[PDB]
């Protein structure tokens, strides 16, 4: 019977160390060679992935794109979708600007 903050806790999972495909703000996508712009719109769109790799099998991904993801696969992780983190279409615009 000990209620606890959700974001704070999920900051304790691998979510805080890497990029979370299913939750993480779409903004943390620029920090790598050519990912942000489009790949992200597809990374972020496209259902939530149970496995970190199911990224590679995304409908219509390009022969090059496919590559990139593979290449960057290093930094992606996953944790249960977080209701509090995804609701409000925050993932597109978290409220965090420079």
């Amino acid at each position: 019977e000990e209620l606890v903050n959700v974001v704070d806790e999920k900051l304790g999972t691998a979510y805080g160390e890497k990029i979370d495909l299913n939750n993480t703000n779409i903004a943390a996508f620029i920090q790598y060679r050519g990912l942000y712009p489009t790949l992200a719109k597809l990374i972020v769109k496209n259902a939530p992935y149970e496995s970190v790799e199911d990224v590679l099998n995304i409908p219509g991904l390009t022969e090059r794109q496919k590559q990139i993801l593979r290449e960057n696969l290093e930094h992606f992780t996953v944790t249960e979708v977080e209701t509090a983190l995804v609701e409000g279409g925050d993932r597109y615009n978290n409220g965090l600007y420079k």
């Binding site: 209620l3 606890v4 959700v6 409000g88 925050d90």
Partner: protein, 242 residues
């Protein structure tokens, strides 16, 4: 035929489309036709808040409430593929649209009960063996109701969920525990459940209107108070196309 400069101000854009009394003429559904919905609209009128019954255990009540925020209530522009699965029943799966209007009605007492009138992630279906939508047909299904507020949001005094001061703050050496309710802000997720019966249908237009009744929950307020139950009533239009 009406321009925005013609309808703005009437507080009409909050009341949505009617179908004149040339209805009852069922819409010819195929089973050979894909079919989708165009701007499904739910205009409401009756907000009832199930009265937090006193400790006594005899039939909890559903009091009537007064609307506050003028006209910021109705919801439409909802669209979604209208599935025609086996046994000839129609299931409508909403993909997106304006559907989360935040309203705050004033309870019997002076209470200000705020809920998030919404029919999001909606999956409504009707009766089986139906090749035609008519005064007969009806739709029942589930919802998804987040919470009045987003993830960020700072209650006065700075606290918050995905941000915010994190504690008692104003009170430094105060007694930590018992404020848990306030400090850690939990975030709710619950089911809705509407019900849609048609009353006016046009055969060609794909248009169909009728009354609806949604029963959902109110404001979790991060953790503050246990939400209050709410039933919602009003008419709804919803044009159908192939």
């Amino acid at each position: 035929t009406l321009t925005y400069d013609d309808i703005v101000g009437t507080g009409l854009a909050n009341k949505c489309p009617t179908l004149d009394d040339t209805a009852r003429g069922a819409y010819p559904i195929d089973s050979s036709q894909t079919y989708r919905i165009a701007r499904l609209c739910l205009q409401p009128t009756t907000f009832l808040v199930k009265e937090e019954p006193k400790n006594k255990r005899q039939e909890a009540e559903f009091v009537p409430t007064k609307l506050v925020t003028r006209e910021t209530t109705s919801l439409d522009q909802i669209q979604g593929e209208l599935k025609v699965n086996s046994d000839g029943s129609l299931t409508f799966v909403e993909e997106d649209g304006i559907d989360f209007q935040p309203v705050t009605v004033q309870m019997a007492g002076g209470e200000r009960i705020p809920l998030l009138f919404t029919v999001k992630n909606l999956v409504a279906s009707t009766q089986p063996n139906v090749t035609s939508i008519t005064t007969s047909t009806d739709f029942k299904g589930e919802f998804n109701v987040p919470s009045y507020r987003t993830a960020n949001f700072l209650d006065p005094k700075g606290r918050g969920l995905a941000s915010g001061y994190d504690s008692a703050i104003a009170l430094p050496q105060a007694k930590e525990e018992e404020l848990a309710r306030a400090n850690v802000k939990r975030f709710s997720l619950t089911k809705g459940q509407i019900s849609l019966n048609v009353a006016k249908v046009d055969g060609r237009t794909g248009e169909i209107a009728g009354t609806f009744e949604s029963e959902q929950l109110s404001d979790d307020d991060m953790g503050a108070h246990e939400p209050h139950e709410v039933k919602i009533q009003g008419v709804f239009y919803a044009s159908i196309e192939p």
